[PDB]
Amino acid sequence: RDLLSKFDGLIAERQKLLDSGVTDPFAIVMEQVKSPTEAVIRGKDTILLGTYNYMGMTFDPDVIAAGKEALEKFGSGTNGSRMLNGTFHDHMEVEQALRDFYGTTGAIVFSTGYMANLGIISTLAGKGEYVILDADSHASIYDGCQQGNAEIVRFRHNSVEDLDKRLGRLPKEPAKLVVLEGVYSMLGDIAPLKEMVAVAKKHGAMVLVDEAHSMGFFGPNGRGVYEAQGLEGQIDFVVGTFSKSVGTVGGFVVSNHPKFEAVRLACRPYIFTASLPPSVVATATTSIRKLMTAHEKRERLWSNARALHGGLKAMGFRLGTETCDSAIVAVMLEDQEQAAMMWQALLDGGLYVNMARPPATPAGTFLLRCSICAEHTPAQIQTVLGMFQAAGRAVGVI
Amino acid sequence: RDLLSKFDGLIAERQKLLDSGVTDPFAIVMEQVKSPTEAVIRGKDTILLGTYNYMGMTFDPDVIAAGKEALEKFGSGTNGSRMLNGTFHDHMEVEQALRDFYGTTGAIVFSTGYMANLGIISTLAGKGEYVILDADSHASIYDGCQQGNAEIVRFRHNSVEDLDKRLGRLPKEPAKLVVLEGVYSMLGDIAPLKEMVAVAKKHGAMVLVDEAHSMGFFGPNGRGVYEAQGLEGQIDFVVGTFSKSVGTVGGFVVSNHPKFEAVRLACRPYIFTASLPPSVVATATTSIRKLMTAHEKRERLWSNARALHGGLKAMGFRLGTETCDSAIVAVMLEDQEQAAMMWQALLDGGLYVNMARPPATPAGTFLLRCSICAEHTPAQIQTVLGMFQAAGRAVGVI
Ligand SMILES: Cc1ncc(COP(=O)(O)O)c(CN)c1O
Ligand SMILES: Cc1ncc(COP(=O)(O)O)c(CN)c1O
Ligand SMILES: [Mg+2]
Numbered sequence: 001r002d003l004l005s006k007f008d009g010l011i012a013e014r015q016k017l018l019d020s021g022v023t024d025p026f027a028i029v030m031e032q033v034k035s036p037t038e039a040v041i042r043g044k045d046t047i048l049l050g051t052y053n054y055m056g057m058t059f060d061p062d063v064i065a066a067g068k069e070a071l072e073k074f075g076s077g078t079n080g081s082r083m084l085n086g087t088f089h090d091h092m093e094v095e096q097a098l099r100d101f102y103g104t105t106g107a108i109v110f111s112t113g114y115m116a117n118l119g120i121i122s123t124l125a126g127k128g129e130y131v132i133l134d135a136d137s138h139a140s141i142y143d144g145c146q147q148g149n150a151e152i153v154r155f156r157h158n159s160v161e162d163l164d165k166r167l168g169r170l171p172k173e174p175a176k177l178v179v180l181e182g183v184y185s186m187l188g189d190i191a192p193l194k195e196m197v198a199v200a201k202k203h204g205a206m207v208l209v210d211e212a213h214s215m216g217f218f219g220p221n222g223r224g225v226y227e228a229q230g231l232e233g234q235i236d237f238v239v240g241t242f243s244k245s246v247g248t249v250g251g252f253v254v255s256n257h258p259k260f261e262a263v264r265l266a267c268r269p270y271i272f273t274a275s276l277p278p279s280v281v282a283t284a285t286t287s288i289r290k291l292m293t294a295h296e297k298r299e300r301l302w303s304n305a306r307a308l309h310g311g312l313k314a315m316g317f318r319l320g321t322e323t324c325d326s327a328i329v330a331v332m333l334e335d336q337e338q339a340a341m342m343w344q345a346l347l348d349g350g351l352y353v354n355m356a357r358p359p360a361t362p363a364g365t366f367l368l369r370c371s372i373c374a375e376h377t378p379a380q381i382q383t384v385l386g387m388f389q390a391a392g393r394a395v396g397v398i
Numbered sequence: 399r400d401l402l403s404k405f406d407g408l409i410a411e412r413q414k415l416l417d418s419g420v421t422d423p424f425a426i427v428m429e430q431v432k433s434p435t436e437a438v439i440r441g442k443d444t445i446l447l448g449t450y451n452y453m454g455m456t457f458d459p460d461v462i463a464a465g466k467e468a469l470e471k472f473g474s475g476t477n478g479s480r481m482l483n484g485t486f487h488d489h490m491e492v493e494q495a496l497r498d499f500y501g502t503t504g505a506i507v508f509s510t511g512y513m514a515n516l517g518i519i520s521t522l523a524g525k526g527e528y529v530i531l532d533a534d535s536h537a538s539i540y541d542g543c544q545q546g547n548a549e550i551v552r553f554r555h556n557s558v559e560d561l562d563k564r565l566g567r568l569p570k571e572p573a574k575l576v577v578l579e580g581v582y583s584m585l586g587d588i589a590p591l592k593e594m595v596a597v598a599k600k601h602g603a604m605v606l607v608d609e610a611h612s613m614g615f616f617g618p619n620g621r622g623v624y625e626a627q628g629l630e631g632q633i634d635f636v637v638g639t640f641s642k643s644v645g646t647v648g649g650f651v652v653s654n655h656p657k658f659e660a661v662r663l664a665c666r667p668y669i670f671t672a673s674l675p676p677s678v679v680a681t682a683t684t685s686i687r688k689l690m691t692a693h694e695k696r697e698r699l700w701s702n703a704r705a706l707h708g709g710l711k712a713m714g715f716r717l718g719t720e721t722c723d724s725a726i727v728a729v730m731l732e733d734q735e736q737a738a739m740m741w742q743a744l745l746d747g748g749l750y751v752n753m754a755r756p757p758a759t760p761a762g763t764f765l766l767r768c769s770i771c772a773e774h775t776p777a778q779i780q781t782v783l784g785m786f787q788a789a790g791r792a793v794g795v796i
């Protein structure tokens with residue numbers, strides 16, 4: 001035995017899945033990507049319905065031009081930390097774009113969203129302090145908790161009551177960080193932020209909200225679920241990503257706290273990594289600024305989401321949500337076999353969706369997760385519904 | 399008090415530095431970057447001598463063209479994990495480029511070097527196992543240890559003897575990971591890998607070597623210090639980055655272990671983050687492949703390093719190394735004031751180098767760290783030496 005013997009189980013589990021005859025879901029390659037909604041997979045033209053490209057920004061002509069210009073003018077990389085030689089013109093631009101987008105004085109960009117969560121959580125809450133989070137929080141949030149030295153307080157998923165009871169049992173004096181997500185990514189339902197933030201404030205906690213799955217399409221300014229629920233000016237920190245609506249790679253945290261920018265001085269995942277390439281921060285800047293006023297896209301996105309959600313529910317699919325509350329539509333299946341058969345039938349018929357099985361999901365939960373794009377056409381959505389009808393019948397789901 | 403009160407000290411320390419009249423070293427902006435060796439900083443044309451762009455790849459015409467083509471053909475981002483919708487043509491290309499570069503069957507790319515270290519260390523060594531590392535290891539290596547659940551065994555910096563004694567006191571049966579760096583980044587000296595790896599193998603440990611600071615210019619194939627020291631086929635895992643010689647952003651681990659690619663199934667910083675943008679992996683692929691045969695650049699790099707090292711030592715600067723052993727030349731100063739005065743004089747005269755002061759360095763260590771580029775000209779290196787002579791005299795260092 002050696003250090004890799006611990007993976008023998010996972011290797012066996014993968015081979016068991018492949019023995020069923022399914023395409024390996026963890027090894028899909030997009031050989032060509034024609035647009036935000038169309039790819040070539042296994043040599044076949046395929047509609048994409050499993051990406052987080054919510055606003056279709058990845059092929060936006062201004063975004064692409066900004067990226068090409070940055071490569072030409074600044075080269076392929078920075079070869080340094082933000083605290084040394086890695087801050088170029090476009091890094092200052094992208095942080096200002098975020099300030100303008102969120103209406104905040106503070107904005108700190110990280111090289112990934114994962115690192116933003118890892119860093120901000122492990123840096124803000126120290127020994128003797130508390131991080132309070134939903135039981136089903138994103139892995140990066142849990143990993144931030146593990147990286148830090150704070151006391152970790154999980155509360156029952158989606159429970160305002162358990163948040164209140166758990167917070168109330170903590171000592172009053174130590175500082176506390178309540179970490180929430182606007183959209184629950186697994187099923188695409190929405191957190192009761194208004195109520196949970198009121199509870200957080202009652203107990204004197206600071207609040208961090210992750211608005212990765214809402215950027216550009218919730219709230220009057222597209223700032224997220226917190227904005228939609230009337231919490232402007234009440235959220236201490238908002239964390240997000242450049243990899244979803246923005247369409248590149250990177251993370252960020254914004255805040256109006258007067259000492260916020262001091263996080264740069266302490267935050268290990270900010271300090272000890274190269275800054276993002278000029279092209280990445282240039283594309284992000286352009287995308288973020290366009291997202292501030294991307295009303296046509298926002299309306300299309302929601303129209304598409306409502307059509308897909310409404311259509312799938314009407315056919316008799318069990319969905320994760322009764323109403324269309326986000327750009328994620330989760331189809332719930334009875335067992336792992338049904339999920340894989342559905343996923344393969346859709347793929348072979350020209351549609352890519354994400355499958356989620358245990359341990360990605362909780363035991364007994366087997367999902368196809370569809371994610372809508374502003375650049376899906378009404379025609380594509382009807383084609384997708386037709387494909388779900390055909391696959392659902394062939395497999396015996398509906 | 400709140401969660402940010404803990405930064406009051408760092409805020410005060412920064413203000414104390416600025417009270418001396420120095421430019422804030424942590425807020426330098428490259429307003430224009432003309433080439434790998436020339437920038438505009440504070441409106442002034444400045445020679446760059448503080449980047450990790452060792453092989454000058456960031457303005458390579460093939461690298462830039464590959465990046466522009468990828469933006470055009472695949473868009474600005476992937477909007478997904480490598481385990482789902484985020485693996486495009488160019489991600490498969492970059493992993494194959496690494497296999498070819500290192501002569502390995504296995505290659506796993508991460509979204510940053512930081513995350514590669516964080517992930518590989520915390521995933522390979524579990525509860526009841528051991529990670530053995532140099533006391534002065536890179537922050538990302540320490541952060542990987544913190545993220546995991548293994549027993550952490552520090553050994554005295556650069557001590558083959560302490561590595562041997564510390565390893566030998568551990569129980570024999572549990573699996574062990576010895577983590578080493580080829581180049582010690584602070585002073586630019588080289589690890590005794592041949593001897594330390596022999597010790598690791600005597601005790602049955604697996605070995606991970608970080609070759610971030612050696613890629614393309616140590617060993618016959620440019621694979622790193624381990625290759626230069628004759629250890630081909632003896633290193634279980636090599637970790638690296640795309641942000642230094644390669645000239646973009648990203649991390650990787652390569653290996654010939656038959657179960658290596660199973661790490662994808664378990665590694666949280668691989669799974670729970672978006673993959674790199676098409677342009678980033680395209681530029682990396684092109685750069686990595688060119689680095690395999692970049693002999694002119696390699697010779698220039700070493701010629702430049704020898705000239706700078708030899709020149710600075712001849713003037714009476716105390717260097718971190720007696721001989722030119724890497725592309726980092728560290729100038730050691732007597733106190734923090736001398737370092738800042740030297741750094742400012744160089745900057746005002748048209749030269750950027752990195753300053754390192756406590757707590758970045760150990761107490762009593764005050765450095766200017768110069769990093770050479772293959773695209774520095776002999777003329778630039780002599781200009782730099784002249785600037786060091788003038789600054790060193792004006793400040794009273796030499
Ligand atoms: C809610 C949430 N927060 C943070 C992240 C991390 O973002 P990134 O992909 O930029 O690392 C993710 C990744 N899907 C996420 O879903
Ligand atoms: C030795 C070493 N290893 C790993 C890293 C992390 O690499 P990256 O900048 O790609 O995150 C660094 C960052 N300087 C490093 O110096
Ligand atoms: Mg095209």
Ligand SMILES: [Mg+2]
Pocket residue numbers: 072073431432
């Ligand atoms: Mg130019």
